[PDB]
Amino acid sequence: KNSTYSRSSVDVLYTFANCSGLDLIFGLNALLRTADLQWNSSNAQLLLDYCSSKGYNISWELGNEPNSFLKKADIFINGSQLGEDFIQLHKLLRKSTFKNAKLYGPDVGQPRRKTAKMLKSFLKAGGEVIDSVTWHHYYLNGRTATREDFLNPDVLDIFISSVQKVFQVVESTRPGKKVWLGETSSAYGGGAPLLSDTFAAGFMWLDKLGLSARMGIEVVMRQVFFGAGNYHLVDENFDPLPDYWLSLLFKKLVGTKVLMASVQGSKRRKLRVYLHCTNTDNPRYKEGDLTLYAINLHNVTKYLRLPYPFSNKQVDKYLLRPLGPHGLLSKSVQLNGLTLKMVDDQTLPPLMEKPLRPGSSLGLPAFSYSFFVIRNAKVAACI
Amino acid sequence: QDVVDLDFFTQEPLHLVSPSFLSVTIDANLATDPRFLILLGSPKLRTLARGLSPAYLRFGGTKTDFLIFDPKKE
Ligand SMILES: *[C@@H]1O[C@H](CO)[C@@H](O)[C@H](O)[C@H]1NC(C)=O
Ligand SMILES: O=C(O)[C@H]1CNCC(O)(O)[C@@H]1O
Ligand SMILES: [Cl-]
C-alpha cells in the first residue's frame, strides 16, 4: 500500500548516512505512472527540490525489482519503458544541482526470477544514463531455508551461474558497464530465523564477497544494516551480529586489487579460498602484502600450504569461530579465541591478529572462516 | 590427509573493486516504522555504521514503489 514520508524522514536518513561517513543512494518510486504509463517525475521533482535546498549530496535509483511490478501492483512496465523512464530521470538530475550525482538501476531480481529479457531491453533503452547496473540476489527462501542449506557448497556454487548470466546480458548491451549487487543476502522473505542472524550466515556472506570480487562485481550492498529482517547486521537491541564483525574484519584486511587462489585438490568445493592485495589504508601492513580468506565447510580441521615463494613468510591469522553454547547458531563470535564486543557505545574493539610461526601450514577448523595476511609478500601487482 | 596445497595467481590485479565494495542497505520499509527517528538517531548505530565507512547506504526495497514524498507532512 501507498504511504507518505516527511522532510523529517529524509533529514533523519541523510544525517545517519552523513554522520556515519556513508554515501546515500535513494530509491525513487517508479510506479507513479501517467495515463500512457510513462514515469510521472512530479513527486520525485518535489524530493529533488527539497534535497537541493538542504545541500544534500545523494545518488539515485528508480524502482525496485521492476520484474515484480505485475505481481505487486498489477502494473506491467516492460524494460524498454523503464529505460525511457531512467532517461527522463537523468535529464531531471542534469537540470538540477544533482547534475554530478550518480544514477543506478534497474534493481532487477536474479536470473532465476526470469529477468533476462527485462534487463536486456532496459540496458538497450536506458543503459547509457546509468553509472552501474544493479541486480539482486538471495540464495534461499527464508521460510523453508535449513541449517544444512546455509552449510551446503552446492547452494554457494549456484551464485556463480547467477553472476555469469547477469554478465552475459550486460556484455551483449553495455560491455564494460560496472555491475553492482544492489541488494543481497542469505534468504528472501526477511531472512531465516536463527540462521540469517547467526555465525552460520557468514559462510554465504563471505563466499558471496569472495566470488563477487573474483568475478568482477564492483560493489555488494548487504540487505540489511539494520531492520526487521533476520538478515540484519545489527539486531533490534543495536547489538552487532556475527556478520557485522565479519564485515568489519573484511573491510580492515581486504584490498581493492583482486587476485586468485585455488585448492589443488580436484573436488569437494568444501574449502573455498580468495586472494586480494592487503588493504594498505591499514597501518600494520605494507605495499605488496596479501590477504587470503578461506572457508572450511568440512567437518574436520584442514591445513593450507602456501605455494612457493610464500611458504616461509610471517602470517597473521584472523580466525572467526562462534562463542558457545549454540555453535553455528550463535549470535556471538570470537576472533582468535577472544569474544568480539563493543568496548562501549562509541568504541569498537581492536581486531587482534594471531601471528603464526613462519613456515607453518594455515590451520582452519571445521565450519570456520579465517583471514590470513601474508606479510612481506612483496607482490608487485600490490605495489 | 587433511593437508591442502594452494595455487595463487599474483601477476596482476584481475579486478579492482570499489573501496566501498562492502556496502549496506536500509529497507525503505523502515521509514514506515514509528520509531524510525529514534532508531537512525542512535549514537550506538552510528558507531557501528562508521566502522563500515567507506560504503554506500542504499535506501530501497519493495516499499520504494509504494512511498510518496509529502513536503507538507511533519
Ligand atoms: C564427518 O561427516 C561424516 C559423513 O561423511 C561422518 O560419518 C563423520 O563421523 C563426520 N566426522 C566428524 C569429525 O564429525
Ligand atoms: O527479504 C526480501 O524478500 C527482500 C527482497 N527485495 C525487496 C526487499 O528488500 O524489500 C525485501 O525485504
Ligand atoms: Cl525494515
For chain A, what is the HEC assignment?
CCEEECHHHHHHHHHHHHHHCEEEEEEECCCCECCCCCECCHHHHHHHHHHHHHCCCCEEEECCCHHHHHHHHCCCCCHHHHHHHHHHHHHHHHCCCCCCCCEEEEEECCHHHCCHHHHHHHHHHHHHHCCEEEEEEEEEECCCCCHHHHCCHHHHHHHHHHHHHHHHHHHCCCCCCEEEEEEEEEEECCCCCCCCCCCCHHHHHHHHHHHHHHHCCCEEEECCCECCCCCCCECCCCCECHHHHHHHHHHHHEEEEECEEEECCCCCCCEEEEEEEECCCCCCCCCCCEEEEEEECCCCCEEEECCCCCCCCCEEEEEEEECCCCHHHCCCEEECCEECCCCECCECCCCCCEECCCCCCEEECCCEEEEEEECCCCCHHHC
Residues of B in contact with A342 (CB under 8 A): 44, 47-48
Q: Spell out which residues line ligand 2, taking CB within 6 angstroms.
A: A 65, 136, 183, 188-190, 223, 229; B 27, 61-62
B24 and A233 within 8 Å at the Cβ level: the answer is yes
Residue span of the structural domain in which A89 resides: 7-258
Q: Give B23→chain A minimum CA distance, Å.
A: 4
Type of residue numbered A115: T
Contact B30 A228 (CB under 8 A): yes
Question: What are the backbone dihedrals phi and psi of residue A7, each rounded to the nearest 5 degrees, phi first?
Answer: -50, -40
Residues 6+ apart with CB under 8 A from A237: none
> If DSSP codes are grouped into helix, strand and coil, which group holds residue B65?
helix
Catalytic residue IDs of A: 65, 183
Closest CA to A374 of A313, A307, A308, A294: A313
Asked if A71 is an interface residue toward chain B (Cβ–Cβ < 8 A), one would say no
By C-alpha distance, which of A304, A64, A335, A62 is closest to A202?
A335
Per-window interface: A 361-380 vs B, CB < 8 A: 361, 377, 379
- Per the structure block, which three cell numbers stand in for B63? 516499499
- CB atoms B37 and A8 under 8 Å: yes
Are A354 and A313 spatial neighbours (Cβ–Cβ below 8 Å)?
no
In which order are the strands placed within the sheet that holds A302-305? A260-263, B3-9, A302-305, A362-364
Domain residues for the domain of B30 are: 1-74
Record the cell numbers describing residue A231, joined without a space.
538478515
Q: Which of B2, B56, B69 sits opposite A5 (nearest CB)?
A: B69
User: Cβ A8–B74 below 8 Å, yes or no?
Assistant: yes
The answer to whether A330 and A323 have CB atoms below 8 angstroms apart is: yes
Q: Which atom of ligand 1 is nearest to the CA of A300?
A: 13
Three cell numbers written together for A67: 520484474
The number of folded domains in chain B is: 1
Strand duo A132-141 + A178-188: pairing: parallel
Annotated binding-site residue? A303: no
Whether the link from the prior residue into A309 is cis, omega within 30° of 0, is yes
With a CB cutoff of 8 Å and minimum separation 6, the contacts of A16 are A22, B26, B40, B41, B45, B46, B49, B57
Cell of A4: 507518505
Quick check: A2 and B18 CB within 8 A? Answer: no
Residue (of A88, A99, A96) closest to A46 by Cα position: A96
d(CA A58, CA A72): 27
Distance from CA of A10 to the nearest CA of B (A): 9
Q: Which ligand ends up closest to the CA of A367?
A: 1
Cα(A291)–Cα(A12) distance, rounded to whole angstroms?
A: 37
Q: Which three cell numbers stand for residue A46?
A: 518535489
From chain A, pick out residues whose CB is under 8 angstroms from the CB of B6: 261-264, 273, 292, 304-307
- Tell me which residue has cell 547489538: A239
**A216 — phi, psi (to 5°)?**
100, 15
Cα dist. A317→A206, A336, A356, B30 in Å? Answer: 16, 8, 7, 38
| Smallest Cα distance from A349 to chain B, Å | 11
Integer Cα distance of A192 and A183 in angstroms: 17
Which residues in A lie closer than 8 A to residue B73 (C-beta atoms)? Answer: 4-8
Q: Which ligand is nearest to the CA of B32?
A: 3
Residue count of chain B, please give it.
74
Beta pairing, strands A338-339 & A333-335: antiparallel
Beta strands in chain B (DSSP E): 3-9, 15-16, 22-27, 55-60, 67-69
Gap between the Cα atoms of A234 and A198, Å rounded: 11
Planar angle of CA A291, A296, A301, nearest 5 degrees? 105
Q: Does the beta-carbon distance from A227 to B50 stay under 8 Å?
A: no
Q: Is A119 annotated as a binding residue?
A: yes
Dihedral sign, Cα of residue A20, residue A130, residue A29, residue A55: positive
How far is ligand 3, taken at its centre, from the CA of residue A110, in Å?
21
| Structural method | X-ray
Among A3, A226, A292, select the one facing B26 at the smallest CB separation.
A226
Write the CATH number for A63.
3.20.20.80
A/B interface, count of CB pairs below 8 Å: 300
Whole-angstrom distance, CA of residue A281 vs CA of residue B19 = 10
**What whole-number distance in Å separates Cα of residue B26 and Cα of residue B16?**
26
Q: How far is CA B39 from CA A18, A125, A235, B43, in A?
A: 15, 40, 11, 9
Q: Which residue has the cell 599474483?
A: B10
Minimal-distance CA residue to ligand 2 atom 8: B61
CB contacts of A31 in chain B (<8 Å) are 65-66
Helix (H, G, I), strand (E, B) or coil at B42: coil
Q: Give the integer Cα–Cα distance in Å for A329 and A31.
A: 40
